[PDB]
Amino acid sequence: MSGKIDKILIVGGGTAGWMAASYLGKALQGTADITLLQAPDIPTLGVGEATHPNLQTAFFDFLGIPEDEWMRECNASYKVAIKFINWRTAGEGTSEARELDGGPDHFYHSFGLLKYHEQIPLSHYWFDRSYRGKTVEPFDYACYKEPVILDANRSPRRLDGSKVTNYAWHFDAHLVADFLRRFATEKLGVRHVEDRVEHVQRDANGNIESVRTATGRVFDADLFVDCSGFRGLLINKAMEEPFLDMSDHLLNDSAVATQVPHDDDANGVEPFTSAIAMKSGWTWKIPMLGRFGTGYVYSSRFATEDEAVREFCEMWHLDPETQPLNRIRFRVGRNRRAWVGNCVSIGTSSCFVEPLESTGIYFVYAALYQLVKHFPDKSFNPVLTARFNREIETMFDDTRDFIQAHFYFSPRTDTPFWRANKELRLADGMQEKIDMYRAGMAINAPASDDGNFEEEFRNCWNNSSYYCVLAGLGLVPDAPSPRLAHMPRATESVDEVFGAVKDQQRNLLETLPSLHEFLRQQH
Amino acid sequence: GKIDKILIVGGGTAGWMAASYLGKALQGTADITLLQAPDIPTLGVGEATHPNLQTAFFDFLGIPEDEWMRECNASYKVAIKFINWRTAGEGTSEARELDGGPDHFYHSFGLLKYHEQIPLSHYWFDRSYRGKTVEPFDYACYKEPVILDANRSPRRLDGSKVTNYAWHFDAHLVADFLRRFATEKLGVRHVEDRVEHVQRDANGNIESVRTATGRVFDADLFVDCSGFRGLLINKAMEEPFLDMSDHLLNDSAVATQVPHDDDANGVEPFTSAIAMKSGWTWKIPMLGRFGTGYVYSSRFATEDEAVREFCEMWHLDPETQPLNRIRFRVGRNRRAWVGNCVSIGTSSCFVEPLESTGIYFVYAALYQLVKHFPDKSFNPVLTARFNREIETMFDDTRDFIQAHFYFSPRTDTPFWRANKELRLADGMQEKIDMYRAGMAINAPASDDGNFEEEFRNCWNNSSYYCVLAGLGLVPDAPSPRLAHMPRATESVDEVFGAVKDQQRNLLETLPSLHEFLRQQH
């Protein structure tokens, strides 16, 4: 008809559903009735989530929830980077970095800012000097202060609370889902109903009229938010929207994961996510308090579940026959359209990719940001739906492209998995970015090098991220940027810029507490 | 190796902007020569500009605003004032009456305030749609219209800047200024000669240019600044020019310079775009004079009809007024940069100056050329990535300008009716759909100098509202979000009130632009 949305039904009560309830509860507050339907499900182990800095500025801040309120309640730790281990060297799946050229085979994709120098990113000066043999230092150690302090498990804040670098969070998603469920029901008036969808009623325009639950209750709404996970009960099963499998870009479709106890008093806490290259995939390590989550993401085309269970358990010296394990088969890809008619998918009902760059929770609140930006009324103007679906489809495919490049540009050829990855095609948009990168250009350079989710959303994979991963793996431009041969003042003074980085490395290495000591003081 | 030698063909405004920008960007690492032939000079009919002329061009050169402004007799521009685009009638310089008021509206450089993450325009239309206001969009949401109605200065007499502004000037004077700067301070070689023959090698790149006196010039990079002739890019390199008169009917102009008593009438701090029967007429106020030109469509008026309509409006004698008559090419090259040849200026692209883009296109392109600067291998990714930046820069402006005519309510002449039968480009038609659905179009990331941000967000939500709501195209209904933000819609009363205060305080304390202009001399 027309008028404002009066009633919203969220189907699904995991992390996405309760993020959707809390974000919509706050954004529309007092002007819509929100109900969430969640059925009891077999519980899983807390295998860990790694996040991005704008989890605080785009989500919890929007809720009005200060970082310390949700941190203490969710037993969270700090993330300063992803550390990529053994992506360039042949061998078994092990937690120890092999040796490369006199050093450990690792590199960092950190959250630090890449400094500009005369309107040109430090990455271009680094490669100019490396190409001409004036340096042999790796890109991440040359252009960021973080690698040196992450090697020493430093805290990102000083013990007086001073923040010295940008950081994200490690936590158990189950605890955040519980925190938000309490927040949404107790403070935003979201109705929780424990029930299982049995039938979805569609009208002759193809919109959802009502959902009937197994107890016979009927829920009607103006807007239906599908947060039912991989099953996609609304968007795929009721609305019949196709899912785009994207196995021609991403071979990984499975995981085996668990949680491992950890003596933080004996070993400290690593302030980073580890992505550890394996024979047929890669393994995440997400440090938490007293434990770490870990999971082997692998490709069913190259390893059986038993082979993956054994490789994963042997690597951590666990018993394959008795270790409590989550065995998962992922749905990799996205719906053809995220929002159809009066049904909006949020979470893995919408899209999923392996967590190689910690996008799972980002995709939820980014989409929720896009839903409110494009919020309809009961007439459901099709431009709003089309302009949202465009944003979701670009957010995902860009991430898909970026992640594929982690495997496509690895030098490894030792197993059928790493060799097969080089036989897939990059998407046209990705290949153009590579052409630019090889031609010495920045890729999606940030407008500034200095909170604003719209800028972050469009430049989420920027020039710093592409250099960190591509140069980390050893793909570097064909030759230096031609604009540097005409800027001898710039290339002569940039020595001071790298020197400022080394000073920060040595000063922060000398004065920062261990992440363990700071975590200990925060309790 | 790196580029050693650059030859610029063409010494108008574009050529000398190219010489100064490249001379500055490459200084000490390339030899630049500019080839310019003696040509019949034209009247200075005036140029209107954008605020980043200072931050993207003169600041890059190291030339402070007061140095070039005073030496080029420039005046200040705060907005374009659109006159009589909603009312039938002859070409007259005075706003007809619409609905209890004059038929004008402003597209200003001011920033649209945000309110709880949402542009003030959305609240304005919500209240106007719900009948809680009848104020036009520009007077409700900007401080500028009130002080522009009173020809106020954008800076106080102590220099305090009160609003964003750009410049009106005679381009020939800025071109002279830049020729002196490039030759005297950047070492650019000036040669007065006429190109007679261009030699191409077997890959189709330019080898050398031979002049009428028999001199031969070679280079690594050739910059075509030869205007509508495209001697390098179109004639020598054979790159097709894409005519785009299926979006823009205007292809001609008759223009002049008219003396003006500033002591009796002050100086208008805005460009006027005055609707005509078969086009529109610009007015660019300068010191003691204004440039003016009737931009019209040859398919709807003869040159004589246009000369008469233009001369009568300004009470000029067609038989004794000095008039420039021009027929331009509307559109752009298929590619701006081909092989070792880069077009800058009207050799590259041209559109009527309805939104003062002419000089912008030059330094925007020069920025992109340096950003994509090649070496002698001419990496094709660099050329393709430059060509793509130029073609969206142009096509976007083309679409925005077409919408000034397409959404005019007028139906009184074949010209205004014909504009409504053209097609909008698919991208513009999507932008219109968003606008009707209550969305912002290309909202500024912030509401607070950075050309990369300015370049991609050049036609943003304020500009679309100023023009579309100016002409009377408004969304189908208020933004659905506002019905869910009752705190925001109740506190926005204050936001409008702050604008009204700023309006009344500046109207009473600002000097006339004339008074500020006189203090600057």
Ligand SMILES: Cc1cc2nc3c(=O)[nH]c(=O)nc-3n(C[C@H](O)[C@H](O)[C@H](O)COP(=O)(O)OP(=O)(O)OC[C@H]3O[C@@H](n4cnc5c(N)ncnc54)[C@H](O)[C@@H]3O)c2cc1C
């Ligand atoms: C096993 C797994 C591990 C992951 N690990 C990581 C990681 O380590 N790092 C990272 O960045 N991202 C990770 N992700 C991705 C990301 O974290 C999640 O996709 C994101 O949190 C959204 O998940 P979800 O709640 O939408 O899906 P789910 O957690 O599967 O939600 C399922 C919910 O749907 C509801 N539901 C289902 N059927 C019904 C029904 N008939 N009736 C009523 N309710 C129903 C239920 O309430 C149920 O709780 C992982 C995803 C999965 C599936």
Ligand SMILES: Cc1cc2nc3c(=O)[nH]c(=O)nc-3n(C[C@H](O)[C@H](O)[C@H](O)COP(=O)(O)OP(=O)(O)OC[C@H]3O[C@@H](n4cnc5c(N)ncnc54)[C@H](O)[C@@H]3O)c2cc1C
């Ligand atoms: C009539 C006209 C009016 C305009 N009005 C406005 C306005 O009101 N507002 C706005 O914003 N923009 C306006 N513009 C656009 C803007 O002014 C232009 O971008 C810029 O001012 C002129 O670009 P140009 O130097 O490349 O063209 P031109 O000045 O025409 O370039 C011609 C140069 O090329 C040289 N040359 C040509 N052929 C040869 C040859 N064989 N050998 C040697 N030298 C050669 C000539 O010697 C000459 O120096 C207008 C443009 C034109 C043409």
